Amino acid sequence: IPPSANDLLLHVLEGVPPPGSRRLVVSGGDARAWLSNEKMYVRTNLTILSPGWLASMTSADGTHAYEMQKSPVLLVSWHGKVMQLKVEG
């Protein structure tokens, strides 16, 4: 039996970071990202296209929140546009 999701994803489905994190600097898109223990969490409404996420949630207003490995670039879809996003860390 797998785990259900991360339950930190309800925290990062809001804007509030996980306890004991480090914030990453999202440039080039409306996302936030934090780094708790070798995993980055993004809080987005862009959709994540390339770098692979390990878990995801989505709130009522279409904010998603993804748990993934530490990738320096995110490839997103904005509105059919395929954009990129730099983080630092």
Applying CB under 8 A, does 47 fall inside the site for another protein? yes
# of chain residues touching another protein (CB under 8 A) = 43
Chain positions 57 to 86 lying near another protein, rule: CB under 8 A, are: 57-61, 65, 75, 77-82, 86
Cα–Cα distance, 56 to 89 (Å, whole number)? 21
Interface pick for another protein out of 33, 36, 53, 87 (rule CB under 8 A): 53
Interface pick for another protein out of 13, 31, 42, 87 (rule CB under 8 A): 13
Cα–Cα distance, 49 to 28 (Å, whole number)? 15
- Strand 64-69 to strand 53-58: parallel, antiparallel, or no bridges (unpaired)? antiparallel
